[PDB]
Amino acid sequence: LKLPASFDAREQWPQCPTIKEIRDQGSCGSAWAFGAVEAISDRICIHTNAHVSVEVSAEDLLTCCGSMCGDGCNGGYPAEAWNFWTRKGLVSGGLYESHVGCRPYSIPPCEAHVNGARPPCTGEGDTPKCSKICEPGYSPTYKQDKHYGYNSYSVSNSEKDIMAEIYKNGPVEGAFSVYSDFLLYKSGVYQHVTGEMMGGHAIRILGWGVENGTPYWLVANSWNTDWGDNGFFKILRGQDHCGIESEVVAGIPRTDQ
Amino acid sequence: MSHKVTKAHNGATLTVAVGELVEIQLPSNPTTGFAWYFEGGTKESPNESMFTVENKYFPPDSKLLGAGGTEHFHVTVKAAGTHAVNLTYMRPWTGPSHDSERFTVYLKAN
Numbered sequence: 001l002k003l004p005a006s007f008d009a010r011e012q013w014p015q016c017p018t019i020k021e022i023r024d025q026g027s028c029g030s031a032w033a034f035g036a037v038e039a040i041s042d043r044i045c046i047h048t049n050a051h052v053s054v055e056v057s058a059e060d061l062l063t064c065c066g067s068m069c070g071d072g073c074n075g076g077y078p079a080e081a082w083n084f085w086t087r088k089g090l091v092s093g094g095l096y097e098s099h100v101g102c103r104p105y106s107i108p109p110c111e112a113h114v115n116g117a118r119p120p121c122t123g124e125g126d127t128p129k130c131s132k133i134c135e136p137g138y139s140p141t142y143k144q145d146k147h148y149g150y151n152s153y154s155v156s157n158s159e160k161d162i163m164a165e166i167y168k169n170g171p172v173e174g175a176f177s178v179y180s181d182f183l184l185y186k187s188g189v190y191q192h193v194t195g196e197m198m199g200g201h202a203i204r205i206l207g208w209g210v211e212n213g214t215p216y217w218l219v220a221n222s223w224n225t226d227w228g229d230n231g232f233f234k235i236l237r238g239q240d241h242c243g244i245e246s247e248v249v250a251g252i253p254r255t256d257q
Numbered sequence: 258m259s260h261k262v263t264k265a266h267n268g269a270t271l272t273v274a275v276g277e278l279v280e281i282q283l284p285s286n287p288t289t290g291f292a293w294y295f296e297g298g299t300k301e302s303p304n305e306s307m308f309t310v311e312n313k314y315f316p317p318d319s320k321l322l323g324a325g326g327t328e329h330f331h332v333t334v335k336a337a338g339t340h341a342v343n344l345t346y347m348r349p350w351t352g353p354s355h356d357s358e359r360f361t362v363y364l365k366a367n
Contacts, residue, residue: 027346029286029323075288075321110347111354121291121346122358123264123284124325175322180314183290183349198287198314200322223290226350 003163008207008218009042009171015050018042019171019206022231023058023095024224026107027121028073033061034222035173035202036081037090042206044147044253046170052255056147057093059103064088064130072127073107078173078202079249082152086251089146091134102134102145109224148254155248159238162248163208171206171220172250176235176242189214189234192242200243208237217244262362270339270363279332281342283360286325287314290348293328293360298349300330308334308342308364332364340364 010020018041025031037056045053062072065084070076084090092101096108106128110121119125132142155162155172165172180195189211207218216234225231235244260271262281273279285293293312295303302310311331317324332342346358353359 025289027286027289027291029288029321029325031288032322070321071319071324073323075317075319075324077321108356109351110356111351114355117356120356120358123346124286178288183287183292196314197316199316199324199326200320201288202322221290223348224351227290227348 003160003167006209007163007167008209009166010206013042013046013050013170016042016045016053018045018053018055021055022220022225023105023222024109025058025222026096026105026109028062028107028127029075030058030062030073031222032070032076032078032081032175032202033058035078035175035204036085037061038204038220038222039171039173039250040085040090040147040149040253043170043251044255047253048255054092054147055094055101057091057101057103057105059093059105059128060090061085063103063128064132066130074124074127078175078247079152079154081173082149082249082251086149086152086254089148091142091145091147099135099137102138102140102142103131104135149251150254152249152251155250157240157246159245162205162245165248165250166205166207169250169252171204172248173202174205174244174246174248175200175202176244179242185228185233187229189216189236191236205244205248264360266362267360268362270365272365273334275335275337275366276333279330279334279364281330281332281344281360281362282327283344283346284325285314285328285346286323288323288325291346292349293330293344293346294349295344298347298352302332307336307338307340308332334364334366337366339366
């Protein structure tokens with residue numbers, strides 16, 4: 001025994017709600033934050049044995065990292081994401097209009113609410129101001145709500161080195177070149193037949209399996225719950241397909257209560 | 258000639274002839290799952306008989322993941338009269354709303 005043929009962290013860690021949770025970046029190019037905070041929340045939980053469980057705000061990494069992480073809603077770097085984690089912290093924050101934690105995500109999808117639907121979902125508009133103020137009623141104040149990381153490393157371009165990391169430590173962030181047919185994806189082990197390059201995109205790899213004889217990574221997107229399989233998808237594994245094995249990064253949380 | 262339309266001209270009436278090209282170019286960040294589309298979430302023209310349409314994406318010059326670029330719709334008008342191009346910046350499997358950024362232009366032949 002070293003390593004299973006099928007793995008899924010959701011069902012390996014039942015008592016950690018977040019690992020099942022699919023956030024939604026709205027119209028910003030911020031998945032770079034989303035992939036980090038999502039694994040981070042998962043890791044925090046896993047590395048306390050579900051004794052601490054928290055939705056880490058992406059609004060936080062999104063709004064207060066400035067240029068050291070990139071450009072906000074105009075795009076960013078996962079690895080910079082994680083040491084911003086380690087060196088400042090990141091607060092609790094949840095979904096658009098959830099009123100969970102300190103900074104809820106402040107950008108929406110586009111259907112449901114109209115009153116001050118506030119910054120709408122226009123072209124390449126600005127990122128939100130870095131606010132550093134907790135939502136009214138949310139209790140522990142801004143700087144005491146911060147969770148820190150220990151470090152941030154990259155995983156090497158290895159398949160075996162990623163399955164190791166995920167199984168010992170929980171989900172990671174990574175990224176891959178998105179091409180046209182990707183959005184067209186509805187189920188299966190994605191593989192690019194066509195389309196031009198769309199850009200790179202950050203994601204969260206939680207698991208792996210073989211289906212129809214095709215080996216694959218289980219990835220979670222940040223495009224809501226009605227994309228793909230309930231927000232989730234699969235991508236061919238073992239071939240560095242679209243860079244999916246190339247750029248993987250993770251941390252270990254600073255657990256000092 | 259090529260007629261060049263952008264976000265500043267949402268809801269204009271551009272005069273054109275049969276077969277001149279119209280670059281309609283607007284910001285689009287596909288990494289968010291939002292592209293620009295005719296009704297129904299397709300990039301094809303609703304009426305291939307009134308006008309014919311192609312589009313392309315142009316990523317940005319950056320390594321930032323989640324950097325956004327520019328979509329072009331190369332609309333050629335194939336028939337006389339007036340033509341609403343109605344695009345909507347949305348997520349196809351999810352569909353438009355009151356809150357979706359919208360773009361239109363009116364193409365007038367002859």
